[PDB]
């Protein structure tokens, strides 16, 4: 339910040019309702999200690139 409400708020932001203030709506886990996280003072460095996407994508791509595994038995 929360993600559906959270997604609905952000959907209106990208389709209604006069409702661009809804981009800041996130999650308020204390009361379990969406909340403007820019007003609430919930901030993260931009580098944290950007580097998370770049690193996770490359790591996921690396594993996705495998389709065959050969495990040599130990020499001992």
Partner 1 sequence: RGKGAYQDRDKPAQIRFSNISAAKAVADAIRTSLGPKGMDKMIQDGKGDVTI
Partner 2 sequence: ADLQDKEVGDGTTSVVIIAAELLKNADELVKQKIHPTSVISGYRLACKEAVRYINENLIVNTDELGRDCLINAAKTS
Ligand X SMILES: Nc1ncnc2c1ncn2[C@@H]1O[C@H](COP(=O)(O)OP(=O)(O)O)[C@@H](O)[C@H]1O
Task: List residues binding partner 1 (CB under 8 A).
Answer: 62, 65-76
Tokens of 10: 């952000």
How many residues contact partner 2, by CB under 8 A?
Answer: 26
Is residue 50 a contact residue for ligand X (CB under 6 A)? no
44 is in an annotated binding site: yes
Of 31, 51, 50, 52, nearest to 40 by C-alpha is 31
Let me know: does 6 contact 27? Beta carbons within 8 Å. yes
Tokens of 33: 């309702």
Q: Which listed range, 1-9, 28-36, 45-53, 68-76, lies at the site for partner 2 (CB under 8 A)?
A: 45-53
Give the one entry of partner 2, ligand X, partner 1, none that residue 33 binds, where binding means its C-beta sits below a cut-off of 5 to 8 angstroms depending on kind: none
């Amino acid at each position: 339910d929360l993600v559906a409400k959270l997604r609905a708020f952000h959907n209106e932001a990208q389709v209604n040019p006069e409702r661009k203030n809804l981009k800041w709506i996130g999650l308020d886990l204390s009361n379990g309702k969406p909340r403007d996280n820019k007003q609430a003072g919930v901030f993260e460095p931009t580098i944290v999200k950007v580097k998370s996407l770049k690193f996770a994508t490359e790591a996921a791509i690396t594993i996705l690139r495998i389709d065959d595994l050969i495990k040599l038995h130990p020499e001992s």
